[PDB]
Amino acid sequence: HKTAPPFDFEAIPEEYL
Amino acid sequence: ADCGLRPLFEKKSLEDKTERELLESYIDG
Amino acid sequence: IVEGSDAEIGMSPWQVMLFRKSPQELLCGASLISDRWVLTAAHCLLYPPWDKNFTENDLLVRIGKHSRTRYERNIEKISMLEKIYIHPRYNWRENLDRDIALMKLKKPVAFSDYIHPVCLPDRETAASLLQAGYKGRVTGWGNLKETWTANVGKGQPSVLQVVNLPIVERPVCKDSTRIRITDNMFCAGYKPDEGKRGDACEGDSGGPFVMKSPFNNRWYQMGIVSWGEGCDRDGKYGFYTHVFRLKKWIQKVIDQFGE
């Protein structure tokens, strides 16, 4: 939805803590 | 039913830097 | 948010990031209204003229965030989606009437200092607060200006942004645009004359327009950021989904499918 740069977001693990 | 009360602001008795602006708008005009 | 400022941490603990998995991007804003339910705009999830129809598996909700891009290990919670519920009379064909959607999280999120739900208004509160001149607050990680204006790089904010805006009289909203404005929309923003500025912008949509009740000190979500003609232009105002008008639909959905 029209809002970002390249390689912008830190990766998100699968944590439940 | 505990909605709308911010742990870091209303629950502690602290105001954020601009909520005053909102209340002034309800009273002044 | 245009002409806003960095949110204080925990200032808006119902703020939700609607995050696209692949390619990774901020889709929209959203709001936490209970431990299993998130509220947003329908146009964020469904708009066929741009071939847009997101399924539950395409997205993640990220709550408790302050930073736009970082994984905030000690604050944020990531949840998957169980079901999207769009307003069945959502009118994408013409003017985004009843631009409202609900999302059921697969598992209930635990509340925290950084994660806490907003209230939905009742009739009294709506009658009291939704008045021309009265200010609400809008927050999001959308753009800092219209794209391809001013300076490109400094377009996306580092941290969540907040701005306060006054509700505008219906006649001025109507006279400000050619689009058919309905009673499921209201509008907000300063007038050219009023010498202050500010607006939602691309990426903030679907997020909350909130007002603090002086009767009980609670924040109520009165609107959902819906549409505008550019961001922060003189004589233009942001338009917001009137959450109270559609509250009966929200409760119908939650009572039926909330386990």
Closest approach of chain C CAs to the CA of B14, in angstroms?
11
Does C43 qualify as catalytic in the annotation? yes
Inter-chain CB proximity C135 and B22 less than 8 Å: yes
Angle, CA of C227, C35 and C32, to the nearest 5°: 20
C92 conformational bin, left if phi > 0, alpha if psi -120 to 50, beta if neither: alpha
Mutate to test the interface with C, among B10, B18, B19, B22 (most CBs of C within 10 A): B22
Q: Distance between CA atoms of C101 and C60, rounded to whole angstroms? A: 15
Resolution (A): 2.4
CATH match of C1-12+118-244 with 2.40.10.10 = yes
Q: By the 8 A CB rule, do C220 and C45 touch?
A: no
Q: Collect all residues of chain B within an 8 Å Cβ-Cβ radius of residue C190.
A: none
Nearest residue, CB atoms, C134 vs list B5, B7, B26: B26
Between the CA of residue C231 and those of B25, C143, C239, what are the distances in Å?
A: 23, 9, 11
Tokens matching residue C15:
């703020």
Does C205 qualify as catalytic in the annotation? yes
- The residues facing C79 across adjacent strands are C61
Question: How remote is the C-alpha of C122 from its chain's centroid?
Answer: 19
Nearest residue, CB atoms, C11 vs list B16, B26, B29: B16
Closest approach of chain B CAs to the CA of C131, in angstroms?
9
Neighbors of chain C by Cβ distance (3+ pairs < 8 Å): A, B
> What is the 3 state secondary structure string of chain C?
CECCEECCCCCCCCEEEEEECCCCEEEEEEEECCCCEEEECHHHCEEHHHCEECCHHHEEEEECCCECCCCCCCCCEEECEEEEEECCCCECCCCCECCCEEEEECCCCCCCCCCCCCECCCHHHHHHHCCCCCEEEEEECCCCCCCCCCCCHHHCCCECEEEEEEECCHHHHHHCCCCCCCCCEEEECCCHHHCCCCECCCCCCCCEEEEECCCCCCEEEEEEEEECCCCCCCCCCEEEEECHHHHHHHHHHHHHHCC
Amino acid at C107: K
Cβ atoms within 10 Å of C193's Cβ, excluding its own: 6
Fold assignment, C13-117+245-258: Thrombin, subunit H (2.40.10)
Catalytic option among C12, C205, C226, C232: C205
Q: Distance between CA atoms of C123 and C150, rounded to whole angstroms? A: 43
Q: Does A15 touch chain C (CB under 8 A)?
A: yes
Catalytic option among C12, C87, C97, C99: C99
Q: Does B14 touch chain C (CB under 8 A)?
A: no
Q: Distance between CA atoms of C7 and C14, rounded to whole angstroms? A: 13
Query: Domain extents for chain C?
Result: 1-12+118-244, 13-117+245-258
Q: By the 8 A CB rule, do C211 and B22 touch?
A: yes
Q: By the 8 A CB rule, do C203 and A3 touch?
A: yes
Q: Which residue shows structure tokens 């399924």?
A: C55
Q: Distance between CA atoms of C125 and C247, rounded to whole angstroms? A: 13
Here the contacts of C107-110 (C-beta below 8 Å, separation 24 or greater) are C107/C36, C107/C79, C107/C80, C108/C35, C108/C36, C109/C32, C109/C35, C109/C36, C109/C63, C109/C77, C109/C79, C110/C35, C110/C77
Q: By the 8 A CB rule, do C10 and B14 touch?
A: no
Identical fold between C1-12+118-244 and C13-117+245-258: yes
Q: Give every CB contact of residue C8 below 8 A, 6+ residues apart in sequence.
A: B8, B16, B17
Query: Domain extents for chain B?
Result: 1-29
Q: Give every CB contact of residue C112 below 8 A, 6+ residues apart in sequence.
A: B7, C13, C64, C75, C77
Q: Distance between CA atoms of C71 and C69, rounded to whole angstroms? A: 7
Q: Distance between CA atoms of C120 and C222, rounded to whole angstroms? A: 7
Closest approach of chain B CAs to the CA of C5, in angstroms?
10
Q: What residue in C sits closest to B29 (Cα-Cα)?
A: C133
Q: By the 8 A CB rule, do C101 and C87 touch?
A: yes
Q: Where are the alpha helices (DSSP H) in B1-29?
A: 19-27
Tokens matching residue C247:
């509250």
Between positions 147 and 176 of C, the ones with CB within 8 A of A are 147, 156
